[PDB]
């Protein structure tokens, strides 16, 4: 049913790949004892404010700690950050887009 936000850590499972139509495929693995849980997802500008104008993958969740999650997103143009997870330990990747 309704899950709460993951409180654990996320690490990149593979390198971020981009598609022809300017989206990105993010593969993350999760560390935490609270799965199944909803994955905190966000994007930011260089300043740090949340863009999050679009997220293709609806309702990203960790169902099993041992299994990684695919998330597709549409970052803004130029330098931005993909942010997976919450808190001081959140996974923060830089990204650049044509």
């Amino acid at each position: 049913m309704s899950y709460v936000m993951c409180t654990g850590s996320f690490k990149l499972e593979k390198e971020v790949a981009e598609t022809q139509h300017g989206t990105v495929l993010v593969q993350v693995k999760y560390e935490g004892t609270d799965a199944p849980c909803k994955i905190p997802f966000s994007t930011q500008d260089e300043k740090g404010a949340t863009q999050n104008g679009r997220l293709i993958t609806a309702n990203p969740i960790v169902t099993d700690k041992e299994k990684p999650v695919n998330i597709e997103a549409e970052p803004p143009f130029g330098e931005s950050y993909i942010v997976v997870g919450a808190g001081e330990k959140a996974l923060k990747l830089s990204w650049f887009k044509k």
Epitope: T7, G8, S9, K11, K29, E31, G32, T33, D34, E66
Partner: antibody
Framework: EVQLQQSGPELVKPGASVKISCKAS????????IHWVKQSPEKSLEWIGE????????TYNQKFKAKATLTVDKSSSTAYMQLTSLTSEDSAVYYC??????????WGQGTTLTVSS | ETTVTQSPASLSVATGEKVTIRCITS??????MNWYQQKPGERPKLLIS???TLRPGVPSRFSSSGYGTDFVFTIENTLSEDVADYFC?????????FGSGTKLEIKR
């Protein structure tokens, strides 16, 4: 700081059972998996299994599935491992660990189990 | 399971020399390899976690590398304090599996 304190040495007869404890402190016990590791007299390390202290969910190594049983107690923040049907092959040093950053870390001091009559 | 073959079983070097230990995995594990030191009478301690990540407080003379199935652990300028057993642990999938260990000794 983070600490895992294991129970003392055990001398058990062949055929009997034993239950080693592992008291956690210095962090949210609920927040991290506890794993158990066996170290044989020949110094070889085998992974026994893991337990989620929040839900009690466990995953075992197939090699230890019929011998080991992992439990937890949120109240005393203590993880337990029970070994049944003991033989001299079970004589070894047993460690408990906290999995964090995907690695086994903050190992306990170990518990020496001797299976002899 | 993912089999981990470690070599050599035993190694001896003089103070200041390079130590090279290796672990080969039966399956592809990316860089999910970890390295542990165990001094006599002590418990294993994590020197290096996944992606050649040196643990805080661990001397910079310890390093690692590899991606896929071929993994190496290195000691630069080996000190006499470094005598111990060294183990690798694959953290890619369950069950977790260890290398059989390497015994390090000093030539003097």
């Amino acid at each position: 700081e983070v600490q895992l304190q294991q129970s003392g040495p055990e001398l058990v007869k062949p055929g009997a059972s034993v239950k080693i404890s592992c008291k956690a402190s210095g962090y949210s016990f609920i927040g991290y998996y506890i794993h158990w590791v066996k170290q044989s007299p020949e110094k070889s390390l085998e992974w026994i299994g893991e337990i989620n202290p929040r839900t009690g969910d466990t995953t075992y190594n197939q090699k230890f599935k019929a011998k080991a049983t992992l439990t937890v107690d949120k109240s005393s923040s203590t993880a337990y491992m029970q070994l049944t049907s003991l033989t001299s092959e079970d004589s070894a040093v047993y460690y408990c660990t906290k999995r964090i950053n995907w690695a086994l870390d903050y190992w306990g001091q170990g518990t020496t189990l001797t299976v002899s009559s | 399971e993912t089999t981990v073959t470690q070599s050599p079983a035993s190694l001896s070097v003089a103070t200041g020399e390079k130590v090279t230990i290796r672990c080969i995995t039966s399956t592809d594990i990316d860089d999910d390899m970890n390295w542990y030191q165990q001094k006599p009478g002590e418990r294993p301690k994590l020197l290096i976690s996944e992606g050649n990540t040196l643990r805080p407080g661990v001397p910079s003379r310890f390093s690692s590398s590899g991606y896929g199935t071929d993994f190496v652990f290195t000691i630069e300028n080996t000190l006499s304090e470094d005598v111990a057993d060294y183990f690798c642990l694959q953290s890619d999938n369950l069950p977790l599996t260890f290398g059989s260990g390497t015994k390090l000794e000093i030539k003097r």
